[PDB]
Design a protein around this nucleic acid. Structure first.
Ligand SMILES: [Mg+2]
Ligand SMILES: [Mg+2]
Ligand SMILES: [Mg+2]
Ligand SMILES: [Mg+2]
Ligand SMILES: [Mg+2]
Ligand SMILES: [Mg+2]
Ligand SMILES: [Mg+2]
Ligand SMILES: [Mg+2]
Ligand SMILES: [Mg+2]
Ligand SMILES: [Mg+2]
Ligand SMILES: [Mg+2]
Ligand SMILES: [Mg+2]
Ligand SMILES: [Mg+2]
Ligand SMILES: [Mg+2]
Ligand SMILES: [Mg+2]
Ligand SMILES: [Mg+2]
Ligand SMILES: [Mg+2]
Ligand SMILES: [Mg+2]
Ligand SMILES: [Mg+2]
Ligand SMILES: [Mg+2]
Ligand SMILES: [Mg+2]
Ligand SMILES: [Mg+2]
Ligand SMILES: [Mg+2]
Ligand SMILES: [Mg+2]
Ligand SMILES: [Mg+2]
Ligand SMILES: [Mg+2]
Ligand SMILES: [Mg+2]
Ligand SMILES: [Mg+2]
Ligand SMILES: [Mg+2]
Ligand SMILES: [Mg+2]
Ligand SMILES: [Mg+2]
Ligand SMILES: [Mg+2]
Ligand SMILES: [Mg+2]
Ligand SMILES: [Mg+2]
Ligand SMILES: [Mg+2]
Ligand SMILES: [Mg+2]
Ligand SMILES: [Mg+2]
Ligand SMILES: [Mg+2]
Ligand SMILES: [Mg+2]
Ligand SMILES: [Mg+2]
Ligand SMILES: [Mg+2]
Ligand SMILES: [Mg+2]
Ligand SMILES: [Mg+2]
Ligand SMILES: [Mg+2]
Ligand SMILES: [Mg+2]
Ligand SMILES: [Mg+2]
Ligand SMILES: [Mg+2]
Ligand SMILES: [Mg+2]
Ligand SMILES: [Mg+2]
Ligand SMILES: [Mg+2]
Ligand SMILES: [Mg+2]
Ligand SMILES: [Mg+2]
Ligand SMILES: [Mg+2]
Ligand SMILES: [Mg+2]
Lengths: 271, 93, 46
RNA sequence: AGGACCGAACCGACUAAUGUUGAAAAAUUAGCGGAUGACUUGUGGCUGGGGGUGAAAGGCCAAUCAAACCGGGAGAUAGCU
RNA sequence: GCUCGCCGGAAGACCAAGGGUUCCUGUCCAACGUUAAUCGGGGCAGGGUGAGUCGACCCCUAAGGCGAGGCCGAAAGGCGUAGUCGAUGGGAAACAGGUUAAUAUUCCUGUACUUGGUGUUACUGCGAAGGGGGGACGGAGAAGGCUAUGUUGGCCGGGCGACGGUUGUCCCGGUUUAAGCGUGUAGGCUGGUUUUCCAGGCAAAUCCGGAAAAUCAAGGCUGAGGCGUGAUGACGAGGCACUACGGUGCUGAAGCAACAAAUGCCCUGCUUCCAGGAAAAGCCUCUAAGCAUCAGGUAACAUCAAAUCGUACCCCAAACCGACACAGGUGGUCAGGUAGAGAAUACCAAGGCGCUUGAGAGAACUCGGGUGAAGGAACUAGGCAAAAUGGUGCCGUAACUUCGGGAGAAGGCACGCUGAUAUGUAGGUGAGGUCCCUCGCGGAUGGAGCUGAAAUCAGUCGAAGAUACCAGCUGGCUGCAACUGUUUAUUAAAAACACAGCACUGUGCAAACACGAAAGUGGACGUAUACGGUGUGACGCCUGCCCGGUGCCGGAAGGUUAAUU
């Protein structure tokens, strides 16, 4: 649910939280965990290559099965869990054969529900089938680019993909961005949407909350000197130039996609 | 079992001082100058061979040489090794 | 007040030591130059 | 509960006086701000000079910064003193 | 040596880092020490650092580094796999007393513990470069049980007081004891157990995970402290004798109890919150190959080993960083008494110091302070500076407000000491004695003793009772910035930066973008409820007209046009 805090202090007045009483409160499943230390936007050269990244809370990586390649064996939702690494919630499923896996938790899937993957799985939320066997018009998430590669589309909270058409070896997908993209029919998908749709109603409320998520402050280019931004300079507040990136590229409307390898797979750009 | 040449080489000289004397009268302990590369087992064996006494335990420390001056010139002495060996309360050396 | 030299033997050795010098050909150029001049102390090691 | 309140440690540095061949190449004394947080601190590590880093002052990068330091081109050039 | 003063959350004590003989003894005063120096961190010489348990080394990993092959690159080199290094983290084990001029958890005394190796015996499925478990982890908050420690009473030794009094409801001092072992308590968590079945754990597995019956319902893991022992012990005021007047030798009484109580322990616990909280080894366990009347595993005993290196001394400082014996800087640990909420503050204890020129005088003037007639901001750029306020409990408190605030608004009253209530109250603690039982660190009853607020009433001293130190000035109107934060280290702290929020725009994932001649890497083990760039800057009401100029987006008819031919 979505609850706003009482204004008992200036840093609390505008905080809007998303509360989920259903999420598990204990520690996550230990054998499905890994460490991932923070980079702070630095690459192997040690240079900042993405700005505004640093700090935040320590996080453990939950190994999430994006492929869903356990065909036939039924599985039951043991619980729903909080994952720091992504905006979506995850679910711990127990397979009939005794194996436990983390999956992306779809909308509406509670504890005790049955899920199944494969051609023989039914048309039910949380079930993973080839898009060849998924009917036209269905709403899916965790969509594959290439067969066997794993879901790479519609993975964040409240996101889904609709199957608009099927012609031969390819189905058409209307992506969340508004783009029409062609995908091989053998690529898998999971029925239903991604849960936690009310993720985007949260209001951070204060600067520190954004600092907790490892986001460092952004400085406007017009607030600095010309030696370190094209926007720099001026006695007082002056702009008089076309807005650009810190590296001189026009940053309002100039298209930057240039990939001739994959233009054939785009039916229609998002526009 | 240590070669006899090594044993004849590991004992340098006996240390004489008020502390060495008091150890000798009270705790039946002789204090010796030994090679910088001498171990406790070698000290024990050499004292049992060349002194004909019986040892029960060896204690070792390394003394650092002093920085001195000779005619307004910097100069330093060598870091040597000192051993306390406890004799078995009947040896009388 | 806090001055610029805050000594640490480990960091001194890792930045300017003999093995740190020998790790690169430019450090070896440093050693070669200091040998040619006749320096009694090639590195911070001793 | 809280980038909540008063207030020591701790981190700072708003006012005044002193000091200005100082006790000190930035401090002392009396007041002052924060003090569970975007806090502070130890140890070790990474980013290198038209480069780094910068909650952005052209700030900081070993008392040096609108282009560090050391060596070299080099006895640069100087219609100037 | 006797007085005086200063610190005492330090200006005491013990470490780490850093330094390197500055430590101790003798000797000297040339130079060094801001003066003298017989003194010294100065000169010179001699001495001093004792470990199976502390630390390193060692085993294991983090960030990161290096990196056989490999990929890439004019050369130099870059990156990176397998590996191998890398603590600031994980991993076995010792306490108390005594002792030197200088070392001690290292030496001695007493009493312990760990690991490993060999051999004898007994039983016996062992075996990993593999599987599983464990190690193993956040913030805040609350309570109970304790201890460290303190106070008092009892007891034991001593005293009867320089000047009125002091055989007492008097004064002074002591009243200490460890690890280890045994006990398994206050407390925390977990339902046991036996069979059978199995797409899972790369192969297997009795191990782990999953499923199903039966049966029991009590078993297991963890755990401060207390008690017993350790301990007929050591220690202990005091006393007796030597003294080289520094100290040496001998003995040694009591050595109990109650109350108070931590920020330390139970506690890596419990509760709750979101921002969701290392790794790997040691350790347990299982099998694979292999070995299978041998090896190998378990237990008893015995013996042997535990190396090497560090250990002095300073360590908020005269020994480290600041050129100095420099009002500076420097991480961790201990934490007594009265008053106090307190690690504030004042005075003290333990302990440590009087800051390496002094002696006079008592001019102007400077600096740091105290007081001031009458006036009260008239000063001045400006109340700068100073003065002033200042605690606890209760009564009481406006506009406006985003309903939280404003607010400690403003303002006001009481406050000491003594007696009574009540020879010490409410409460807290809590023995005996007794009673019950699965008999013990049990339950129930009980209340001796100890401890002890707050209040009312009466009385009483002073000019003054929040009496010292300590410790908000208050109110009104208005600009700017929503707010907490950040910044010109060293003349600017702000209205500047950031901010939560908003909008535009890019980006379909081998993403855009960034660092890289490249390989690669970050973005991100993320996937449009995501990520980058730009502008604006909580919130409320809102954001109007212009596409001519210049950008950017879309288009492709007609003109122009490169290499080419
Ligand atoms: Mg950004
Ligand atoms: Mg922004
Ligand atoms: Mg500016
Ligand atoms: Mg420019
Ligand atoms: Mg202007
Ligand atoms: Mg203009
Ligand atoms: Mg606060
Ligand atoms: Mg600052
Ligand atoms: Mg200033
Ligand atoms: Mg101050
Ligand atoms: Mg405040
Ligand atoms: Mg405060
Ligand atoms: Mg400027
Ligand atoms: Mg500088
Ligand atoms: Mg230049
Ligand atoms: Mg030239
Ligand atoms: Mg010249
Ligand atoms: Mg004090
Ligand atoms: Mg000396
Ligand atoms: Mg002199
Ligand atoms: Mg003289
Ligand atoms: Mg001395
Ligand atoms: Mg001396
Ligand atoms: Mg040793
Ligand atoms: Mg020993
Ligand atoms: Mg190679
Ligand atoms: Mg490499
Ligand atoms: Mg290693
Ligand atoms: Mg370490
Ligand atoms: Mg000592
Ligand atoms: Mg006690
Ligand atoms: Mg505390
Ligand atoms: Mg010592
Ligand atoms: Mg001095
Ligand atoms: Mg000083
Ligand atoms: Mg400090
Ligand atoms: Mg002086
Ligand atoms: Mg005077
Ligand atoms: Mg005056
Ligand atoms: Mg006055
Ligand atoms: Mg007056
Ligand atoms: Mg008057
Ligand atoms: Mg008046
Ligand atoms: Mg006036
Ligand atoms: Mg005037
Ligand atoms: Mg003032
Ligand atoms: Mg004042
Ligand atoms: Mg105005
Ligand atoms: Mg502001
Ligand atoms: Mg400044
Ligand atoms: Mg990539
Ligand atoms: Mg602005
Ligand atoms: Mg407009
Ligand atoms: Mg054309």
């Amino acid at each position: 649910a979505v609850v706003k805090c009482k204004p008992t202090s200036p840093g609390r007045r505008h905080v809007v939280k998303v509360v989920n009483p259903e999420l598990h409160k204990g520690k996550p499943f230990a054998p499905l965990l890994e460490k991932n230390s923070k980079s702070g936007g630095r690459n192997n050269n040690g240079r900042i290559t993405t700005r505004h990244i640093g700090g935040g809370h320590k996080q453990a990586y939950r190994i999430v099965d994006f492929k869903r390649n356990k065909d036939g064996i039924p599985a039951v939702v043991e619980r729903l869990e909080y994952d720091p690494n992504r905006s979506a919630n995850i679910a711990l499923v127990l397979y009939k054969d005794g194996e436990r896996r983390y999956i992306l938790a779809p909308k509406g899937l509670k504890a005790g529900d049955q899920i199944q993957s494969g051609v023989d799985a039914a048309i039910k939320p949380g079930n993973t089938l080839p898009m060849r066997n998924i009917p036209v018009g269905s709403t899916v998430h965790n969509v594959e680019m290439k067969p066997g590669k794993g879901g790479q589309l519609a993975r964040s909270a409240g996101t889904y993909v609709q199957i608009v058409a099927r012609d031969g070896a390819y189905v058409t997908l209307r992506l969340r961005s508004g783009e029409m993209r062609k995908v091989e029919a053998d690529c898998r998908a999971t029925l239903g949407e991604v849960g936690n749709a009310e993720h985007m109603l949260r209001v951070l409320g204060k600067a520190g909350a954004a600092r907790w998520r490892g986001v460092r402050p952004t400085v406007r280019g017009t607030a600095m000197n010309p030696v370190d931004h094209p926007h720099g300079g001026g006695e007082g507040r002056n702009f008089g130039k076309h807005p650009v990136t810190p590296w001189g590229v026009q940053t309002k409307g100039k298209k930057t996609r240039s990939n001739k390898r994959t233009d054939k797979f785009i039916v229609r750009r998002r526009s | 079992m240590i070669r006899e040449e090594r044993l004849l080489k590991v004992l340098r000289a006996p240390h004489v001082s008020e502390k060495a004397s008091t150890a000798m009268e009270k705790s039946n302990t002789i204090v010796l100058k030994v090679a910088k590369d001498a171990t406790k087992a070698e000290i024990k064996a050499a004292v049992q061979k060349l002194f004909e006494v019986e040892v029960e335990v060896v204690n070792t420390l390394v003394v650092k040489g002093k920085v001195k001056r000779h005619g307004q010139r910097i100069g330093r002495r060598s870091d040597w090794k000192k051993a306390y060996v406890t004799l078995k309360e009947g040896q009388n050396l | 007040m806090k001055r610029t030299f805050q000594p640490s033997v480990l960091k001194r050795n890792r930045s300017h030591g003999f093995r740190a010098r020998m790790a690169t050909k430019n450090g070896r150029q440093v050693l070669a130059r200091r040998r040619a001049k006749g320096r009694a102390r090639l590195t911070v090691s001793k």
